[PDB]
Amino acid sequence: KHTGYVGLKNQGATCYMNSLLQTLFFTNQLRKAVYMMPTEGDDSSKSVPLALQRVFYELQHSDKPVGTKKLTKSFGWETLDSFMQHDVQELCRVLLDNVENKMKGTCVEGTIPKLFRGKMVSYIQCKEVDYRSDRREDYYDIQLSIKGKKNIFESFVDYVAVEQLDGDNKYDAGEHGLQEAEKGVKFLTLPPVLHLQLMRFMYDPQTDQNIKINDRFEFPEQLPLDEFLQKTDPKDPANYILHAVLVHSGDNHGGHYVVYLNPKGDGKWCKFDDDVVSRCTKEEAIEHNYGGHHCTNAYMLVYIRESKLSEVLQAVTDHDIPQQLVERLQEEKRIEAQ
Amino acid sequence: TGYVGLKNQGATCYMNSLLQTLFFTNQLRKAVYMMPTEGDDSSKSVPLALQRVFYELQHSDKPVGTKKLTKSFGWETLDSFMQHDVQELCRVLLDNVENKMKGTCVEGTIPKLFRGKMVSYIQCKEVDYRSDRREDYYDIQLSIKGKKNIFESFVDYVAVEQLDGDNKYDAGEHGLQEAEKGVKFLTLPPVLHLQLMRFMYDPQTDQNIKINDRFEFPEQLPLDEFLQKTDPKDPANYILHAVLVHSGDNHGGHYVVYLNPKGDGKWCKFDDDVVSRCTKEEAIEHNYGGHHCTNAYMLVYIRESKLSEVLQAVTDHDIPQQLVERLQEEKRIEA
Ligand SMILES: COC(=O)c1ccc(CN2CCC(O)(Cn3cnc4c(-c5ccc(CN)cc5)n(C)nc4c3=O)CC2)c(Cl)c1
Ligand SMILES: COC(=O)c1ccc(CN2CCC(O)(Cn3cnc4c(-c5ccc(CN)cc5)n(C)nc4c3=O)CC2)c(Cl)c1
């Protein structure tokens, strides 16, 4: 009510889910394209696209906290710990893959790659012979190492750092035999919506299963990324605006998951805590989640390219929801009300 | 502390708390070890799953897992535990074990430990008719809204209710009559499970909401004046054994339990895998509530006179060799 935004019910150990759902919902261009999916023939029992349409609809219209049971049912994560055994980016990929496939053949085909997909090069360059292997790869999200790094910039420096293949890890160069080489990645494109997960756990033998890295890790409100591009572009520099901060406090999957957002990209932040949505300060959304200098910190960041902000966050009206969809969900709600 | 914890493996809410609370019911634990579970399916048996959890809590150096248990009684959905009160889960477990103990040398352990008796009376005002009927109970739900403490809650619980107007009592001959109904406790069990009514329907909305009001409970609880008839050689004096605590507003809040397992006033906090010695004030007064939203929702009391028996020592010998061998082979196969 207060903030203009409604929250999501707490209905299980769904960990990152309500955070990710709010984050996706406020990707306005995505929300609109999801509204356009042709789901009239869909089975309301099995359709992930319809379930996301329903959730987004309620988030746009409802005054009361929105429920998500049909959604988790639709993509089959219903056990006591099914969310504990997946990272947030896997849930994102399930959701986005479903709706992307559903958009095939429609006027919004390719929305998901347009918003979230970038491209990178992986190379192996032989040092002592002349042979290089190049592999262009798409990515929808980036996992950044934080252990030993102070900020996003050092994480990106680490990401594109050259690795040496020598000694017992020499590269199989085919007819050139075993060779000393160097292996690394470079960014070719950065997408309009940039999903960064921070590596906040670590599966090491010395730590048995998984411990949470609670170290301080700084991210800026404004992130410039041109220097990590293979080739910059003067008519659109890679300047990114912080949009979402998904936060975990505690040490285990019983910890507290919340998400901070400035949904208009205007620097005015709210905290989304399941059913409770509250106005908050910039400091509480950003610095306070850097981590102890004490276990409350960010594990995922969403950035939007400056040049794409107005389009990615384009206004959404009630009229943007097609009439059939509105009547189907209204009838669901009337059937429930009886 | 000498005590091991339980793994966080889901939104099990009160389960780990209840589990520790029942494990440190030493007499219950011993009787659980004695159940004849040798022919039981290691996947179907709730009694075996309880034996296995208890054994691990007694021996393991590492946080103890609970998955075979939750499978055994089939609460495996995302919100299985959100839709049940703690006393329902306790009853599921105790019904399972009690039934398994039928026809065994420990038959009756569950009622002996947890089952008390009250009388429910209906007394007619204008005619001469009184109906007395005994009811049994394993737990008591105490109203806290507008109650200062446990004493006032018990006073509310035995308070007389008027059956008048359009809810007159249909006694048997005198016809519809104006009467008054109430309960008195006939007996109080050696182990007293008290759930506090910490949620209520709020008219201002239309959900259940959590009452975070202050509510006091004592370390020593005299309950004689709530009996129908007292016993001058054995007054109903109880000692606080467990404080099951919830902090927050919702089932995503934080569940912990405080215990003094030996009845000696040396208190520990059980937070899943973390078991930490703590002050008496942190177990007791700090969980009264008032304005964190951290407070007791369940209390376990033990009759003073029964203390040393309920908390009788349990040794490795008390676990039959067949059960030990079965669980050992179970963890051998896990390789
Ligand atoms: C046992 O109790 C705990 O210890 C504990 C419980 C919950 C949490 C919070 N949740 C952590 C996971 C989450 O999905 C964020 N997230 C996602 N991916 C990660 C990868 C990573 C890197 C590379 C690749 C290959 N391409 C795949 C994954 N690594 C190394 N760490 C993470 C990570 O934290 C969402 C929040 C934490 Cl922090 C600790
Ligand atoms: C928005 O609110 C929340 O999301 C919220 C979420 C979790 C909790 C904590 N959990 C509360 C339930 C718990 O089972 C304790 N418990 C048990 N039985 C109760 C009855 C009662 C009375 C009579 C009868 C008929 N014989 C049956 C039940 N009533 C009226 N209240 C309770 C109660 O609190 C365990 C801990 C709370 Cl406090 C609030």
UniProtKB/Swiss-Prot annotation, chain A:
The keyword rRNA processing does not apply. GO terms for molecular function: cysteine-type deubiquitinase activity; cysteine-type endopeptidase activity; deubiquitinase activity; K48-linked deubiquitinase activity; p53 binding. Coiled coil: none annotated. It is found in: Nucleus; Cytoplasm; Nucleus, PML body; Chromosome. Changing C15S: Catalytically inactive mutant. No effect on p53/TP53 and PTEN binding but is defective in deubiquitinating p53/TP53 and PTEN. Partial loss of KMT2E/mml5 deubiquitination. The C-terminus plays a role in its oligomerization. This is Ubiquitin carboxyl-terminal hydrolase 7.
